[PDB]
Amino acid sequence: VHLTPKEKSAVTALWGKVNVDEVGGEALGRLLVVYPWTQRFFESFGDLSTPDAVMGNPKVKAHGKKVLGAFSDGLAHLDNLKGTFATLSELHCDKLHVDPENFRLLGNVLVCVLAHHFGKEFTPPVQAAYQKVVAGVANALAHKYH
Amino acid sequence: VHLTPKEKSAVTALWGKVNVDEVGGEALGRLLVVYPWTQRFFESFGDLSTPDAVMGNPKVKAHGKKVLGAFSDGLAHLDNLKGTFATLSELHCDKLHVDPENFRLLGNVLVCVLAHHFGKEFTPPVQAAYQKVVAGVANALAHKYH
Amino acid sequence: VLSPADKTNVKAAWGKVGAHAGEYGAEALERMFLSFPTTKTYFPHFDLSHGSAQVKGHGKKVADALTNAVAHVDDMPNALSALSDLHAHKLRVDPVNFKLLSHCLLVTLAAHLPAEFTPAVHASLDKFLASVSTVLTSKYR
Amino acid sequence: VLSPADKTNVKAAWGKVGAHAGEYGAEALERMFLSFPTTKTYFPHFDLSHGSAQVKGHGKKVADALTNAVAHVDDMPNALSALSDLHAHKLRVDPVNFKLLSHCLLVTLAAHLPAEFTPAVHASLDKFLASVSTVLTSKYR
Numbered sequence: 001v002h003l004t005p006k007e008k009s010a011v012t013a014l015w016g017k018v019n020v021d022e023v024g025g026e027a028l029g030r031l032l033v034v035y036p037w038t039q040r041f042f043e044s045f046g047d048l049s050t051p052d053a054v055m056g057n058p059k060v061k062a063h064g065k066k067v068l069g070a071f072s073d074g075l076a077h078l079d080n081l082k083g084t085f086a087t088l089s090e091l092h093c094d095k096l097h098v099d100p101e102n103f104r105l106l107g108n109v110l111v112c113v114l115a116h117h118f119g120k121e122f123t124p125p126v127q128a129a130y131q132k133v134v135a136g137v138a139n140a141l142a143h144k145y146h
Numbered sequence: 147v148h149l150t151p152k153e154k155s156a157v158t159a160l161w162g163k164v165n166v167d168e169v170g171g172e173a174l175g176r177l178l179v180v181y182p183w184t185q186r187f188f189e190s191f192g193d194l195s196t197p198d199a200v201m202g203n204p205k206v207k208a209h210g211k212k213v214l215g216a217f218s219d220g221l222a223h224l225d226n227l228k229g230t231f232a233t234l235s236e237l238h239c240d241k242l243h244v245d246p247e248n249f250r251l252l253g254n255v256l257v258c259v260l261a262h263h264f265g266k267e268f269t270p271p272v273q274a275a276y277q278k279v280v281a282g283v284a285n286a287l288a289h290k291y292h
Numbered sequence: 293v294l295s296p297a298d299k300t301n302v303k304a305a306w307g308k309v310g311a312h313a314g315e316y317g318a319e320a321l322e323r324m325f326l327s328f329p330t331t332k333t334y335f336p337h338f339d340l341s342h343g344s345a346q347v348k349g350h351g352k353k354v355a356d357a358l359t360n361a362v363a364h365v366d367d368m369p370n371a372l373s374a375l376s377d378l379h380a381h382k383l384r385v386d387p388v389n390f391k392l393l394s395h396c397l398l399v400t401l402a403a404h405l406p407a408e409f410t411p412a413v414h415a416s417l418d419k420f421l422a423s424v425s426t427v428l429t430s431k432y433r
Numbered sequence: 434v435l436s437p438a439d440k441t442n443v444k445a446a447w448g449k450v451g452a453h454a455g456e457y458g459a460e461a462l463e464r465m466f467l468s469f470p471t472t473k474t475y476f477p478h479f480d481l482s483h484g485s486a487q488v489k490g491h492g493k494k495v496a497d498a499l500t501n502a503v504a505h506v507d508d509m510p511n512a513l514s515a516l517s518d519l520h521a522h523k524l525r526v527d528p529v530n531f532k533l534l535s536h537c538l539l540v541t542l543a544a545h546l547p548a549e550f551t552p553a554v555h556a557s558l559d560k561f562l563a564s565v566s567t568v569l570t571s572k573y574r
């Protein structure tokens with residue numbers, strides 16, 4: 001992904017203000033609520049019946065912190081996203097068999113959560129920068145399908 | 147794309163029997179009938195109002211011959227699809243601005259045309275082989291979006 | 293949404309299937325498993341080998357469901373109401389998997405009915421299958 | 434298709450937009466043009482720069498059509514019938530571009546109404562926008 005130097009600055013500046021304990025858990029949480037078919041991959045997580053139960057679930061918040069950690073790991077390695085996500089690409093593709101379209105949906109839900117948390121500050125050019133990032137993370141995680 | 151040696155043989159054997167004058171034009175023709183929005187990219191082609199007019203259009207048949215020639219070019223260079231479709235990726239992405247989802251749709255319409263022309267001979271494992279090919283061609287033509 | 297010309301073409305194309313329903317649905321299922329191996333995880337309890345009795349059995353169920361969908365084409369959400377709750381709520385099937393089976397169903401129909409598979413009928417069947425997919429992915433809690 | 438709880442959340446969330454409709458629609462359009470440059474080609478007669486009178490004028494039209502969609506939520510195919518013809522026949526818009534504007538609309542709704550953008554309402558609004566998208570992509574020759 002070809003990110004403009006001004007876009008690399010805008011991203012890291014916004015990412016340093018991100019609540020690492022809540023945001024990721026909210027992304028995964030909303031993914032499971034907005035797109036219910038994703039819950040079949042998380043049968044061992046517990047009570048996922050109501051929206052409040054998904055968001056309040058301890059296993060969702062905990063795993064969500066790891067997903068956010070993987071997005072932070074990808075922001076430090078923008079030049080080599082394929083190698084950064086190579087191990088995770090094997091897990092999500094060869095083992096779990098998750099359709100690559102869902103990677104793109106989680107990325108878009110992350111963009112929605114960042115919008116929900118920052119408001120006006122998540123200006124249109126900042127979104128444009130994050131869309132390039134989440135699309136790059138998606139393609140990298142979908143490499144074992146190519 | 148990781149093609150099995152037996153799958154490589156099945157593809158070339160079936161491709162040598164392909165009518166180079168008609169098949170490609172039928173693929174593009176059906177793409178314009180089944181998925182009408184693709185017609186906006188071909189405003190200079192003429193009469194595209196009725197299904198028979200799309201199929202009977204000389205500009206569609208002639209351009210379809212070139213698309214089929216690009217698929218044949220990709221079958222001889224399965225190891226390096228990115229480099230084979232590098233120039234065509236610049237045309238379809240940076241100049242024409244075609245959504246990468248349409249590439250997959252044309253590949254799937256080609257598969258439907260090969261099925262229409264060969265019948266029983268287009269056995270399930272032969273389709274599986276061609277699905278790997280058309281997905282590799284789509285992903286290679288979509289490189290300028292990565 | 294469909295069209296009165298779409299409905300005519302779907303009734304006529306699927307009419308020439310008839311007795312061959314279970315072979316066609318099974319062939320479409322087999323074409324799906326070999327082309328997109330990710331779909332095999334929805335059926336671990338099935339013998340997925342060529343000529344499998346479960347794939348041939350299920351293929352009949354799939355085809356009969358599509359026949360019932362052609363019958364009640366103007367009231368599809370109600371006719372496939374039980375099937376929607378089954379695919380969406382119980383099995384939690386990914387919407388992409390429906391585009392992949394729909395494609396295989398079109399390949400099967402092309403491979404078997406060349407006189408019926410005109411560009412116009414291809415357009416109609418794609419729309420029908422897309423409409424069926426839309427209904428089976430609809431989840432009302 | 435929708436739910437009676439989905440309709441309640443859509444009417445409640447969109448009811449807090451009200452007067453800010455044109456700003457939100459224009460912002461949604463700007464977020465789309467900047468994030469997905471392929472959508473720009475549908476508006477070559479428009480000034481696409483920030484604070485453009487045209488993007489501000491069209492955003493009002495898009496928002497007003499969505500306001501009319503919230504009004505006739507039980508009969509959307511009939512309400513947006515003129516718009517369906519426009520987007521599918523004449524303009525020939527790629528269905529993917531609707532998923533992108535729909536996303537941008539949700540990002541705008543998230544960035545302006547955080548009290549209303551609860552997980553249940555996110556789901557409701559996504560299903561509403563997907564429904565409006567289905568109607569506008571439906572082409573009956």
Ligand code: HEM
Nearest residue numbers: 038041042066067070071096098102103106107137138141
């Ligand atoms: C957008 C890219 C995504 C990222 C960065 C991501 C990241 C991760 C990480 C960091 C792990 C755990 C690795 C470990 O400690 O072993 C993981 C596991 C997993 N991911 Fe993802 N993921 C993504 C998308 C998805 C999606 C969209 C789904 C579901 C539809 C999914 C389903 C899973 C599952 C089922 C696990 C295993 C959980 C377990 O240990 O039980 N992931 N993912």
Ligand code: HEM
Nearest residue numbers: 184187188212213216217234242244248249252283284287
């Ligand atoms: C994956 C399949 C595809 C292949 C391999 C392919 C191949 C080609 C080739 C060989 C050319 C002509 C290059 C030249 O001689 O200058 C071309 C041009 C073009 N392609 Fe494609 N194409 C594909 C998909 C698409 C799709 C799916 C669309 C549109 C929805 C599209 C739209 C066009 C247009 C608009 C032109 C220019 C025609 C003109 O010169 O007026 N192509 N394509």
Ligand code: HEM
Nearest residue numbers: 331334335353354357358379383385389390393394424428
């Ligand atoms: C073209 C759309 C489809 C139709 C018409 C269809 C039809 C059916 C029918 C009739 C049943 C049997 C229910 C019963 O016994 O009462 C069923 C079950 C099932 N379907 Fe589908 N289906 C469709 C697509 C899919 C897809 C895309 C998948 C996933 C790859 C899928 C996975 C399943 C599974 C896992 C069951 C097995 C239930 C059993 O073991 O009996 N279906 N489907």
Ligand code: HEM
Nearest residue numbers: 472475476494495498499520524526530531534535565569
């Ligand atoms: C959320 C769905 C959408 C709604 C409610 C919507 C609404 C509208 C409305 C109300 C008009 C004005 C028609 C008139 O002048 O009478 C229109 C026109 C148009 N729409 Fe959309 N639209 C939507 C999505 C899209 C998308 C996704 C694109 C493509 C990127 C698009 C492209 C156009 C174009 C090119 C026109 C301008 C025609 C002109 O210059 O007058 N629309 N749309």
